[PDB]
Amino acid sequence: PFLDIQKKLGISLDRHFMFLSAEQPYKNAARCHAFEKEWIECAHGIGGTRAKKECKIEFDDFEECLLRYKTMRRMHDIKKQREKLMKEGKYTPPPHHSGREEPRP
């Protein structure tokens, strides 16, 4: 913040709900709690300029957890190949994936 009134006075008007890893009602952690925590603890201390290069792995994991682009790519590719193989006639959907399974408790 431009003027650090809150840090100066020791109060926390709005600094406690900045990210997904902050305290949630009834201790229900948000999606990607672990990833965000890792990224932020990695990036503490070192400046932003250094973090942008030295916490990149953590940030990449975090964005993957939150948006999930690569997961969508992977599932799309798997189901695309499934469709191609099925149209060719070289694959069958197993019983458990088809609709009849031995349902587990």
Ligand X SMILES: CCCCCCCCCCCCCCCCCC(=O)OC[C@H](COP(=O)([O-])OCC(O)COP(=O)([O-])OC[C@@H](COC(=O)CCCCCCCCCCCCCCCCC)OC(=O)CCCCCCCCCCCCCCCCC)OC(=O)CCCCCCCCCCCCCCCCC
Shortest Cβ 5–ligand X spacing (Å): 9
- Residue list 5-24, contact with other proteins (CB under 8 A): 5-8, 13-20, 22-24
Binds 10, which of other proteins, ligand X, none (CB < 5 to 8 A, cut-off by type)? none
**The CA-based dihedral angle spanning residues 46, 51, 56, 58, taken in that order and rounded to the nearest 10 degrees:** 50
Residue 89 touches other proteins, criterion: CB under 8 A:
no
Residue 54 backbone phi and psi in degrees, to 5: -105, -10
CB of 47 to other proteins, least distance (A): 7
Quick one: tokens of 68?
């999930």
What burial class does residue 36 get, using C-beta atoms within 10 Å of its C-beta: 0-12 exposed, 13-18 middle, 19+ buried?
buried
**Residue 85 near other proteins by CB under 8 A:** yes
Angle between helices 69-88 and 56-67 (to 10 degrees): 60
For residue 20, what are its two tokens? 């997904």
Nearer to ligand X, 6 or 71 (CB): 6
Instruction: Map the footprint of other proteins across residues 20-59, applying CB under 8 A.
Output: 20, 22-28, 30-32, 34-38, 41-42, 45-52, 54-55, 57-59
